[PDB]
């Protein structure tokens, strides 16, 4: 797929759009 989606989830499940980080793309 995509190391950065990878991270992608990875962000998103340690901390998604306003629930955390801003995005790892």
């Not at 962000?11 to 801003?22: C, I, V």
């Amino acid at each position: 797929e995509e190391e950065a989606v990878r991270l992608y989830i990875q962000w998103l499940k340690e901390g998604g759009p306003s629930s955390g980080r801003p995005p790892p793309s």
